[PDB]
Amino acid sequence: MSAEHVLTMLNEHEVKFVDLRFTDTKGKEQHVTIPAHQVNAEFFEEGKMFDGSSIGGWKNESDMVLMPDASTAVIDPFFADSTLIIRCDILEPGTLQGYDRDPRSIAKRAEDYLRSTGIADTVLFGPEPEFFLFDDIRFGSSISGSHVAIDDIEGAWNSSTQYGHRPAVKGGYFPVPPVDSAQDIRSEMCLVMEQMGLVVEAHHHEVATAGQNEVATRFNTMTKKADEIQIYKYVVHNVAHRFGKTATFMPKPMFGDNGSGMHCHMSLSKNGVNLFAGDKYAGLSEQALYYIGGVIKHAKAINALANPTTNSYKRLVPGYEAPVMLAYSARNRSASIRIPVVSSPKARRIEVRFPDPAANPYLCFAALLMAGLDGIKNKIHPGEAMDKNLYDLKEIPQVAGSLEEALNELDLDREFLKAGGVFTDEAIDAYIALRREEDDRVRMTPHPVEFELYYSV
Amino acid sequence: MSAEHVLTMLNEHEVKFVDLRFTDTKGKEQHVTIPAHQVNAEFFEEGKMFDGSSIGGWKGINESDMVLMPDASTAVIDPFFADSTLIIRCDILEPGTLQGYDRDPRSIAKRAEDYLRSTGIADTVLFGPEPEFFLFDDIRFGSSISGSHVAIDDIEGAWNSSTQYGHRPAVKGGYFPVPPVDSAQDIRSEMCLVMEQMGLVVEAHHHEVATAGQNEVATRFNTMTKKADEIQIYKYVVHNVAHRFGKTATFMPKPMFGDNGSGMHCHMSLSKNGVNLFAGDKYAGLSEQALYYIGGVIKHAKAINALANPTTNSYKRLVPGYEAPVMLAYSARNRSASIRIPVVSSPKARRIEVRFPDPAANPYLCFAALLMAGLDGIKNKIHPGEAMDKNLYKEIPQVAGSLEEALNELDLDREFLKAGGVFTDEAIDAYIALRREEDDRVRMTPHPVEFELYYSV
Amino acid sequence: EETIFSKIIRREIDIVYQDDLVTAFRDISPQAPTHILIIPNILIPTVNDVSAEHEQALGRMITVAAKIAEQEGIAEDGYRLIMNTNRHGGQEVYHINMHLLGGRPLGPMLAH
Amino acid sequence: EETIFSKIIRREIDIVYQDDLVTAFRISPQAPTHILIIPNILIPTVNDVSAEHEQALGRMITVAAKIAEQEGIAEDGYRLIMNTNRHGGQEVYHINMHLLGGRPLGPMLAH
Ligand SMILES: *P(=O)(O)OC[C@H]1O[C@@H](n2cnc3c(N)ncnc32)[C@H](O)[C@@H]1O
Numbered sequence A: 001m002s003a004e005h006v007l008t009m010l011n012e013h014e015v016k017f018v019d020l021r022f023t024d025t026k027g028k029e030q031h032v033t034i035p036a037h038q039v040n041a042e043f044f045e046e047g048k049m050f051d052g053s054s055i056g057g058w059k060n061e062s063d064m065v066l067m068p069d070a071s072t073a074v075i076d077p078f079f080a081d082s083t084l085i086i087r088c089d090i091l092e093p094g095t096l097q098g099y100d101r102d103p104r105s106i107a108k109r110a111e112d113y114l115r116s117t118g119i120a121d122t123v124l125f126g127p128e129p130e131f132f133l134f135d136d137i138r139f140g141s142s143i144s145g146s147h148v149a150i151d152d153i154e155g156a157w158n159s160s161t162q163y164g165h166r167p168a169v170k171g172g173y174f175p176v177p178p179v180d181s182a183q184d185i186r187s188e189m190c191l192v193m194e195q196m197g198l199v200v201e202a203h204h205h206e207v208a209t210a211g212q213n214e215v216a217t218r219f220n221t222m223t224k225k226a227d228e229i230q231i232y233k234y235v236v237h238n239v240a241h242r243f244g245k246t247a248t249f250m251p252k253p254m255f256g257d258n259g260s261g262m263h264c265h266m267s268l269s270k271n272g273v274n275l276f277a278g279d280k281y282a283g284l285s286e287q288a289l290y291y292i293g294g295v296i297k298h299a300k301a302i303n304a305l306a307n308p309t310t311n312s313y314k315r316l317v318p319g320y321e322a323p324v325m326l327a328y329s330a331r332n333r334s335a336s337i338r339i340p341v342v343s344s345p346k347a348r349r350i351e352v353r354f355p356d357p358a359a360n361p362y363l364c365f366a367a368l369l370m371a372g373l374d375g376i377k378n379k380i381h382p383g384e385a386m387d388k389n390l391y392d393l394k395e396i397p398q399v400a401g402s403l404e405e406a407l408n409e410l411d412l413d414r415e416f417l418k419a420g421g422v423f424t425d426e427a428i429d430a431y432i433a434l435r436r437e438e439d440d441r442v443r444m445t446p447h448p449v450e451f452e453l454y455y456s457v
Numbered sequence B: 001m002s003a004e005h006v007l008t009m010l011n012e013h014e015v016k017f018v019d020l021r022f023t024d025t026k027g028k029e030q031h032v033t034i035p036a037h038q039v040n041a042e043f044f045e046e047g048k049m050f051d052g053s054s055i056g057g058w059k060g061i062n063e064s065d066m067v068l069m070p071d072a073s074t075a076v077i078d079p080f081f082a083d084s085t086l087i088i089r090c091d092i093l094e095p096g097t098l099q100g101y102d103r104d105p106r107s108i109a110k111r112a113e114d115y116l117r118s119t120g121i122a123d124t125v126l127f128g129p130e131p132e133f134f135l136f137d138d139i140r141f142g143s144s145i146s147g148s149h150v151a152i153d154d155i156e157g158a159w160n161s162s163t164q165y166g167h168r169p170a171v172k173g174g175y176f177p178v179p180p181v182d183s184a185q186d187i188r189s190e191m192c193l194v195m196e197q198m199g200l201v202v203e204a205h206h207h208e209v210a211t212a213g214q215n216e217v218a219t220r221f222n223t224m225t226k227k228a229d230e231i232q233i234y235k236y237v238v239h240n241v242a243h244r245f246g247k248t249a250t251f252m253p254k255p256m257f258g259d260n261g262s263g264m265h266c267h268m269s270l271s272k273n274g275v276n277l278f279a280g281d282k283y284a285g286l287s288e289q290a291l292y293y294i295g296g297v298i299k300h301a302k303a304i305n306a307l308a309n310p311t312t313n314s315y316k317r318l319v320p321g322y323e324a325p326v327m328l329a330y331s332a333r334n335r336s337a338s339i340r341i342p343v344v345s346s347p348k349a350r351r352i353e354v355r356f357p358d359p360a361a362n363p364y365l366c367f368a369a370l371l372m373a374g375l376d377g378i379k380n381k382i383h384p385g386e387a388m389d390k391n392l393y394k395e396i397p398q399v400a401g402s403l404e405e406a407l408n409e410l411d412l413d414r415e416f417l418k419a420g421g422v423f424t425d426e427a428i429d430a431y432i433a434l435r436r437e438e439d440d441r442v443r444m445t446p447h448p449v450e451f452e453l454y455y456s457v
Numbered sequence C: 001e002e003t004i005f006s007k008i009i010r011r012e013i014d015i016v017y018q019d020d021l022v023t024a025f026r027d028i029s030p031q032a033p034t035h036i037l038i039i040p041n042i043l044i045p046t047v048n049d050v051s052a053e054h055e056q057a058l059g060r061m062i063t064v065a066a067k068i069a070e071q072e073g074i075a076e077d078g079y080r081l082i083m084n085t086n087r088h089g090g091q092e093v094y095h096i097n098m099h100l101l102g103g104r105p106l107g108p109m110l111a112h
Numbered sequence D: 001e002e003t004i005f006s007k008i009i010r011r012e013i014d015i016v017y018q019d020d021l022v023t024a025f026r027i028s029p030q031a032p033t034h035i036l037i038i039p040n041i042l043i044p045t046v047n048d049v050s051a052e053h054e055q056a057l058g059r060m061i062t063v064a065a066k067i068a069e070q071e072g073i074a075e076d077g078y079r080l081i082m083n084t085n086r087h088g089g090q091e092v093y094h095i096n097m098h099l100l101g102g103r104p105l106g107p108m109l110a111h
């Protein structure tokens, strides 16, 4: 679309309010609403001034410009009044250039750097988020202690709860519609997503009980796919709220059951041909192997962006169907990087399984793309594939086991993100500080399991 | 003690009632009380006639009465009744003939001892049972057409860490805790004191592995019939002391799932003219007679299982993968062997330890079955084979996996325990019928776990 | 002192092959479908006690192993030569005994 | 024809002990003390051992004992395992005797 198209759409749909939306460093979507009559031709050329001091990690004077993107005009399906959602970029007031800490500006810089390197023209992302549907969640903390309570009908622990078909633990994958009580909610989510520009492939119940559901969305270019992931999170949250449920994208909400993950499919295209298709292992090319090697080498530094929460590392544990070995294979379930089998060379891609849904889409995608580009530029070989049985069987590098370790690796390993000006040093420092605050909070607070273990000793 | 000693004891303690006690086929202790003035010289020569038709397996088509013949050597003052009561254990004898009733367990044990003396192998047999029990604050169970339920509650239970009313033993972690953690120190001390007051000899008492109050009081060995009487006194003492402390004591094999069960390790020793026949120059200091005893126990072990594991719950703890051994082999170091050889300082105390029997077993019947199996092995010279010493270089048999299998084996292999008239075919048939009634009741009723598996399918 | 394999060397008591320094015997309890043992003719307690004097026979052990594998025809299928020592591995002979396991597709090295 | 160990002998590409006919290496630790021994002369498979090069076979175990004394594992227990052809799992396609120890070793093979 364009500015004129948005102006015509305002009259066509009788729009009353225009919502300007943007994403902070944490990944949350912020929005400011303005009346429809306040949108003019000069609005798309000058933007709206706003203060980013209250936004975490964006802190003498913090007056910044909200520049709307007319190509992202989407009618809000949930607001009572007719509202048009326009995604916006954060720009500096004077130079009118992308803010260094703006995730969308960083993603656009990464795409521009990819185009400038001459390696490829476009990058394609295929993330597959997962979410949990709950009826009631209660958490709190104080000097007296802390607690968390998760309750929903589909939970296997409600077999005898006063108020009988519900999924068992680790057995909610593809159940009957009576047991899978999340069919109408998923269908409504798919319809709302299609109303908002998303293309939905399939939706199904996930392995974990207590209402884990997955809605599959078609791939797109990196920045558009990150915007689509933001819209996906928004619609999931709101449609869950409208049905009396609550939706969370937390990686490991409960122990003893499968966690939520975000497998990302990556591909590179130049002049309309797939650069990851060749005659190497699993139908890949030399550039695909270089991309895999670059991802593997900087994977621990990636974890600070693709796994920014401490629950993401309670998911990334040996066992429990969460890959931790940083190898690539087409059949090995333990490999973090997987090469899916496809019918045509045009759809050959590389799948990374360690990222979590709580990750910032822009930052995670930019980090993965920059790692792959560094691997291609430096010609980093991924090594031999982990698809061989050596004498029926520990030097394989492992994904970062804690948020502190990932943040330290990100602090030490910075060049692959600083190449091309995609990630400035100040933005990385601010992100590290923001994540370290949460790490300190989670580390300093006593755990109930600590009481179960070390109260009588 | 003789009848005169019993009369003098009655006069000295101002005893007002005399309790005549005996054990039925199921193992329960049945008692009938009479006034002290009804006890005289002719009482010990003629006994008291009673109707045993109401007893479980003592029914007869002729509805004949039976005689309660007191044993003066078993006189002991009851420590729980408000009035002074003297407990006298009695044997069930047929009228006129004044011979031991065929279905009376004590008469069967006496017959087994007489057969052991008559065969000439040994003069005395020593038993070293080590019963375990659970202490529960409250137990609620029920069954009906609408369903069944069981609920166990105790302060020491690990599940009560959040129950409103904080040192408790963890699951499989109640073995030798600090005095604050285990709340049964005073109860066990009182049990030991009152057991020693009743003629028992106590070695040690301690908390056992399972949570929710599993305790063991060790008692010294004795001859077979006297040791069975001591086991009955042990059960009575445990039950009454638990009742007087506001607790509930159970000798059920596997009251809880996921926690250690209750077992009764039995130690065997044959003595002739004061020397221990089980001491020799064979494996682990054993003799040839001891090896033949082990072989006889192994060969008939399934037949013994009907008497040493009378209950369906007895095979909930005999499932492989727990503390209770299941393999039909003997070793001095291997934990998986059902027959163990304890290490002792002197040959005078060398014994054979069998570990499959449960505390729910009838003491007289279980001891008689084990002794008869050992005697058959000695007479037929059944070599057990080789010890289960795990070397890094003929499938090992196993105990019965269900009560039905053990009952069938007892029905088929009943000749070893019919030698010398220790058991008569009517006794085995009645015992099998009573155990099959319980087996049918357990098998024909729906299980709550079945609803967790076969309700949505 | 000596072991039962010393008696077998003396021929006082299933010989597969005989040589001045190396002999091959069938296992009493074959742990593999084709389990053939190999020992030196000179009594040596452990391989830890091997000196350069008898190191000539140690190569003859492997040569006899190859010859026996070819004779049995298990050369193409594959075989494993195991020579355990000391407390680990269940050394219960206290004499040099090379194991030749073959026929069945064998498992992994060690036990894991 | 030639394997990785062939280039390792030429030093064209973690040596523990080097001899005229025997070289020792430390590459994926399967045991706390996993050290390999190969012949300097290339032998594709142990069945193809010729009597001309059969003398280094004894020096293999001699070096193994020397290493076990050096490694301090001779007081615990060790195995000398040679895998051959497909059933053994010959991966380097060259003679390679494994000196493994440092922890209680299991049985000869896993059932
Ligand atoms: P470990 O290598 O210590 O045990 C060697 C095995 O050799 C077998 N074996 C022992 N004795 C004989 C005889 N006399 N004949 C054939 N095979 C024998 C056993 O399997 C030992 O475990």
Ligand SMILES: *P(=O)(O)OC[C@H]1O[C@@H](n2cnc3c(N)ncnc32)[C@H](O)[C@@H]1O
Pocket (backbone or CB within 6 Å): D004, D025, D026, D027, D028, D036, D082, D083, D089, D090, D091, D092, D093, D096
């Ligand atoms: P198989 O019984 O042939 O065992 C294969 C062993 O080869 C070792 N290995 C392969 N490649 C190397 C290199 N480059 N350096 C050292 N060791 C190597 C593996 O350690 C296997 O144990």
